[PDB]
Amino acid sequence: NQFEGNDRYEGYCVELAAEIAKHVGYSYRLEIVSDGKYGARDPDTKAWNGMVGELVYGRADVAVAPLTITLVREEVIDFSKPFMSLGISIMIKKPQ
Amino acid sequence: YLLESTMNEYIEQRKPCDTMKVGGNLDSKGYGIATPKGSALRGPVNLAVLKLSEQGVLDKLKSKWWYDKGECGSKTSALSLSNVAGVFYILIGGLGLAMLVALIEFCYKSR
Amino acid sequence: NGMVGELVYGRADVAVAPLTITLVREEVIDFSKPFMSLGISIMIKKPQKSKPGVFSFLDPLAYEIWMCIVFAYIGVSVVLFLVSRFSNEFGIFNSLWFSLGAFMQQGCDISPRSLSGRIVGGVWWFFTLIIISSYTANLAAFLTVERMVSPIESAEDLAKQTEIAYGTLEAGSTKEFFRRSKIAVFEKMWTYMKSAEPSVFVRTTEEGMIRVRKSKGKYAYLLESTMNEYIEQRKPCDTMKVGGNLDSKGYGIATPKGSALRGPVNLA
Amino acid sequence: NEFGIFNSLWFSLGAFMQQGCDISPRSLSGRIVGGVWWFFTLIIISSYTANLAAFLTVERMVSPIESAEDLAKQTEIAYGTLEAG
Amino acid sequence: DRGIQMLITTVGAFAAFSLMTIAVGTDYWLYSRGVCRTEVMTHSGLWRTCCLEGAFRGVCKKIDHFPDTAEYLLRAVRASSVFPILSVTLLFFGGLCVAASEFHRSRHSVILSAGIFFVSAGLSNIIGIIVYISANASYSYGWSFYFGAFSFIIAEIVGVVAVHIYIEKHQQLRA
Ligand SMILES: CCCCCCCC/C=C/CCCCCCCC(=O)OC[C@H](O)CO
Ligand SMILES: CCCCCCCC/C=C\CCCCCCCC(=O)OC[C@H](O)CO
Ligand SMILES: NS(=O)(=O)c1cc2c(cc1Cl)N[C@H]([C@H]1C[C@H]3C=C[C@@H]1C3)NS2(=O)=O
Secondary structure (H helix, E strand, O other): OOOOHHHHOOOHHHHHHHHHHHHHOOOOOOOOOOOOOOEEEOOOOOOEEHHHHHHHHOOOOOEOOOOEOOHHHHOOEEEOOOOEEEOEEEEEEOOO | OEEEHHHHHHHHOOOOOOEEEEOOOOOOEEEOOEEEOOOOOHHHHHHHHHHHHHOOHHHHHHHHHHHOOOOOOOOOOOEOHHHHHHHHHHHHHHHHHHHHHHHHHHHHHHO | OHHHHHHHHOOOOOEOOOOEOOHHHHOOEEEOOOOEEEOEEEEEEOOOOEOOOOOHHHOOEOHHHHHHHHHHHHHHHHHHHHHHHHOOOOOHHHHHHHHHHHHHOOOOOOOOOOHHHHHHHHHHHHHHHHHHHHHHOOHHHHHOOOEOOOOOOOHHHHHHOOOOEEEOEOOOHHHHHHHOOOOHHHHHHHHHHHHOOOOOOEOOHHHHHHHHHHOOOOEEEEEEHHHHHHHHHOOOOOEEEEOOOOOOEEEOOEEEOOOOOHHHHHHO | OOOOHHHHHHHHHHHHHOOOOOOOOOOHHHHHHHHHHHHHHHHHHHHHHHHHHHHOOOOOOOOOOOOHHHHHHOOOOOOOOOOOO | OHHHHHHHHHHHHHHHHHHHHHHHHOOOOEEEEEOOOOOEEEEEOOOEEEEOOOOOEOEEEEOOOOOOHHHHHHHHHHHHOHHHHHHHHHHHHHHHHHHHHHHOOOOOHHHHHHHHHHHHHHHHHHHHHHHHHHHHOOEEEOHHHHHHHHHHHHHHHHHHHHHHHHHHHHHHOOO
8 A cells, every 4th residue: 555556566477577677678567457367268259368368459568477378378479488387286285 | 276386386385384285297388478469579578588597587586486485494314312302301300309309318317 | 500500591491409498599590489498407427335334333313312322321320329329339430330231231230229229220221221222223224324425416516626527518508508607606617617628528418428427526517407317317327417407498499580480380 | 138019119110121130039929920020021112112113214104196196086085276277 | 639539629610610601601502504684604502693604794693482382391491591501500509519618617518519519510401401402403513512511521520529528528537
């Protein structure tokens, strides 16, 4: 509440967006996606939702979230080289 | 829960640390900076990411936001003193008791 | 020169080799998304399996337990003497002998007769039973346990010392990485490598592998983790990867800048 | 040198703790008591140190799942994912 | 041999007290890596942690002893350092009795009480060490630690000699 704008947030991707902006030489405002979803094409409507939807339809110019590189998404948006590796993993409650 | 390994690791490093990653990774992939198809930002962003990677910036950011968080920081092995400390407490307790009994048995026999 | 040269000058249309994605190369050729991850890593000649020490019989217990056993032994012996003189006989020398025999599970000529002497004796017997049982459990295992110790076991360790020479493949991504580095450790490493005579660099991975194998643990080869792992698994497997990875990167399928194959290759 | 109560207690304790004693029973009934107590001691102490060795060497707290296949094979644990991910 | 025994006792009592007081005061118990907070190689003691490398070399911060009943008790006992302090106290009273044995000779029990104080001081010391090491669960022990250990050894030697003095006294005056 004491802060306003892009300075309201912190985290890995916040600093990454800052550094990218520095290197590229542009100003930016961090808009949180409205849907709160990462991105998927609804098979019935064929509409992209979430961050991917926001990118495609023109409402946003970049996405600096933990957005996974996938074939379906690469067909509709451009991705840079990966900035972090990962895999699908299982999370279980630790026994006592 | 099936989630991405990065989030899984971050969660497992924070209280209430009752969750844990099991096994390996089901596949291998990565996050990318996205842009609209036919954008003019595509090339510069790619080059920026390469610069950031080669300069250790991404490494430092990862190390900062994952490892340094550490809300909870948690086959011939030597026994440690902590494993047997109880036997030492009993021992010194017993020596104390023996000295006490000896003073009594004295004072009783002195009177 | 090499594959990148061929791509730039138009001699080829694609490169499907283990070509590292780097900034300098990205400015002249178009890379795909990486198809394999790697990092820079250290290969050293596998050290000999160290035989356990002359004093390996101490190994089942931490040093601090041994120290505390010794103080406990003195404590018990002094308190025994004291209580007995307050009550052959338990002078200090015999108290020391009694305690030592109790601990070693031997017994000796004398046993306490007083109540306080018997309390001391009883708790020392109990202590002995717990500690000796714990010590003797796995003893033969500790006496026969070989542990290989790496000379360096880190990048910093390799930078600090000067007895082991370390090199790279030249005209490779790793050499370029070290040359253009700004990190303290890697700048130090490069300053060393540039000046070192004879040249620490090699022409081929096989060359570096042979150099580590024939240098009797005086050469450490800096190569990509994928090749390192592959080699370390092959016979005679007398090499070993030491420490973690110095960085993170990946191999990409290259194409000449402005190629028509760029998009299809990425999607493939 | 005789088996009054305090020396009886001391004899028994030494036998149990594997130390031995000043004194040993000489009568038949004393030796019956001593002999069964020696037997009891040998079983119980041996059981303690046998089983102690086991506790000092067990270190494999094995997870039920340990892999994807083990999650797929069972049906007691439900596993999900994030939507639109 | 009465003179030599009393010399050993008196010098020994002073030695043990000095060593133990230094040890409790000084901060070279443990050489571990850590942070003096304005990780780096530090030297710690019972009370303080202090840096040996960097810009903050010589900055020294108070230990947070408190960052299960058994765990709580261990933390409490470690925090207070009741056992090392009790060892210093008992060594103080032992030395006091040793001094008093020269003046008021009429009561023999004074030198015996010195003996009992020194023996007890050593037992307090052992408990201290065990609590210290147990609570700390790469590292190494420094010279303050070894001073505590040498204090234990000397205290036990002096306890033995004091008790011998009293025995010689009760064996001379009965006959
Ligand atoms: C004349 C004969 C003289 C007799 C001389 C006596 C010495 C013999 C041995 C004493 C063992 C010590 C007793 C150990 C008891 C520990 C109990 C304990 O700690 O219990 C924790 C509990 O399980 C909650 O977790
Ligand atoms: C010289 C003075 C005399 C001293 C004498 C005392 C020594 C006693 C020792 C051991 C008794 C153990 C005997 C236990 C044997 C019982 C089991 C058995 O024999 O068989 C079981 C059954 O027949 C099939 O299931
Ligand atoms: N440490 S990490 O896992 O966050 C991480 C992961 C990666 C990094 C950098 C870091 Cl710091 N860089 C690479 C990038 C550099 C060039 C090689 C692969 C891409 C382009 N992506 S990655 O291999 O996914």
